[PDB]
Amino acid sequence: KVFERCELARTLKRLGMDGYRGISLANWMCLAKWESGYNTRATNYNAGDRSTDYGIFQINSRYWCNDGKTPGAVNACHLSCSALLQDNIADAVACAKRVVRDPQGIRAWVAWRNRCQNRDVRQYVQGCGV
Ligand SMILES: CC(=O)N[C@@H]1[C@@H](O)[C@H](O[C@@H]2O[C@H](CO)[C@@H](O[C@@H]3O[C@H](CO)[C@@H](O[C@@H]4O[C@H](CO)[C@@H](O)[C@H](O)[C@H]4NC(C)=O)[C@H](O)[C@H]3NC(C)=O)[C@H](O)[C@H]2NC(C)=O)[C@@H](CO)O[C@H]1O
Ligand SMILES: CC(=O)N[C@@H]1[C@@H](O)[C@H](O[C@@H]2O[C@H](CO)[C@@H](O)[C@H](O)[C@H]2NC(C)=O)[C@@H](CO)O[C@H]1O
Ligand code: NA
Known part of the structure; x- marks a missing residue:
């Protein structure tokens, strides 16, 4: 699924990511945009290690x-x-x-x-009302 920017921002807010470990929601959103383009199906195979990054946050296996x-x-x-x-x-x-x-x-x-x-x-959260 490809989340729309504000849809994800709302979700992350609800799940208490805003300020988690001192990281702002804007930072989390920036991270999600560049790691996967807000895509839950994103996978990245690392041929030089045989590991795989999965999902929206590209978590490494x-x-x-x-x-x-x-x-x-x-x-x-x-x-x-x-x-x-x-x-x-x-x-x-x-x-x-x-x-x-x-x-x-x-x-x-x-x-x-x-x-x-x-x-x-600030741009990754503008107009989301979060
Ligand atoms: C080819 C390429 O670059 N692909 C990218 C992926 O690598 C990248 O995922 C990130 O991968 C790195 C490297 O393996 C990984 O960082 C490692 O994190 C572990 C866990 O935290 C560290 O081990 C801990 O070290 C501390 C201190 O040394 C110990 O106190 C602790 O005991 C260790 N923890 C555990 C559980 O054993 C490694 O030292 C550290 N290695 C390096 C080189 O930094 C990241 O966590 C991966 N990130 C994520 C989100 O999974 C992927 C995402 O950035 O992107 C590809 O481009
Ligand atoms: C312009 C932009 O937002 N591009 C997105 C890409 O960033 C993203 O690719 C990912 O790029 C990261 C660096 O920007 C890499 O660290 C990461 O390996 C790579 N992820 C994958 C899964 O290849 C892609 C991925 O969905 O989306 C673009 O929109
Ligand atoms: Na593993």
């Missing part, structure tokens, strides 16, 4: 979900990776909260670092 085919991986979110390719994003949100709590924090997300860091991100 080496550490966070079990996909059964990533060599030497762990499953810190205690979820099948398949659960991150769903229309309901409650599981993806719970996992993103776990991810941000690792030492690295929001730096775990490469697209965030490249397109959102050190920028004014």
Whole structure:
């Protein structure tokens, strides 16, 4: 499913992502836009590691979900990776909260670092009334 910007913003707000671990909703929205284009079906295979990034937040199988085919991986979110390719994003949100709590924090997300860091991100939430 491809979420519309404000639809996702509303959802994330409701699921308490606004200010989570001090991260603003605008940052979370920026992250989702550049990681997957707000697409729950997005997958990215990393041929040089045999890991896969899944869903709206592009959560990596080496550490966070079990996909059964990533060599030497762990499953810190205690979820099948398949659960991150769903229309309901409650599981993806719970996992993103776990991810941000690792030492690295929001730096775990490469697209965030490249397109959102050190920028004014108010645009990803404009006109959403969140
Ligand atoms: C080819 C490419 O770049 N593809 C991108 C994906 O890599 C990327 O997903 C992110 O992948 C990185 C690298 O594996 C991963 O970062 C790792 O995170 C783990 C878990 O937090 C770290 O291990 C922890 O380290 C701390 C301190 O060293 C320990 O205290 C702790 O015990 C460890 N945790 C666990 C559970 O064991 C790794 O050190 C760290 N590695 C690096 C190099 O930073 C990110 O978490 C992945 N991000 C997400 C959201 O899954 C994907 C998304 O950015 O994008 C592709 O482009
Ligand atoms: C212009 C734009 O919003 N592009 C979106 C892409 O960012 C996104 O591709 C992702 O790009 C990230 C860097 O911007 C990469 O870190 C990441 O590997 C890549 N994700 C995938 C799944 O390839 C795509 C993906 O849906 O959507 C574009 O709209
Ligand atoms: Na795994």
